[PDB]
Amino acid sequence: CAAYQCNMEGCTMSFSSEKQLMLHKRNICPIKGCGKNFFSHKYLVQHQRVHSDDRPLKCPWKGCKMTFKWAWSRTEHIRVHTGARPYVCAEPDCGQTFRFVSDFSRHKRKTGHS
């Protein structure tokens, strides 16, 4: 089509004109009114995702209006609705359960438990 695609390895961005593609190749932010410049294309791509508030993945639980960027975040969230606590501590006199793996990992660090 009329769009100008970026040819940098891994990049999926496209632009209305060659002008904006050239500015993109100079690692200038694509967002109107930002103007920030970056040392590499890696730094540029990391930055522009901060401007995004797009959360494409909706919670499937009826009544819930929450939305998510990543599938793992949505999957973890659904456990709040189901009450699932998949991670159980292995120590003899603890028996503590966790909803998210990061909470289970935090418990193993803070207290010396299996």
Q: Quick check: 59 binds Zn ion (CB under 5 A)?
A: yes
6: annotated binding-site residue?
Answer: yes
Is the sign of the CA dihedral 58, 34, 21, 42 positive or negative?
Answer: negative
Q: What is each CA distance from 88 to 58, 74, 75, 99, 111, in whole angstroms?
A: 28, 21, 18, 9, 14
Among 19, 42, 56, 64, binds Zn ion (CB under 5 A): 64
Which residues ranging from 67 to 86 are in contact with Zn ion (CB under 5 A)? Answer: none
Q: Quick check: 89 binds Zn ion (CB under 5 A)?
A: yes
Angle at 83 between CA 80 and CA 86, to 5 degrees: 100
Among 14, 20, 73, 96, binds Zn ion (CB under 5 A): 96
CA distance 112 to 63: 40
Q: Quick check: 57 binds Zn ion (CB under 5 A)?
A: no
92: annotated binding-site residue?
Answer: no
Question: By the criterion CB under 5 A, which residues form the site for Zn ion?
Answer: 6, 8, 11, 13, 29, 31, 34, 36, 59, 61, 64, 66, 89, 91, 94, 96, 113
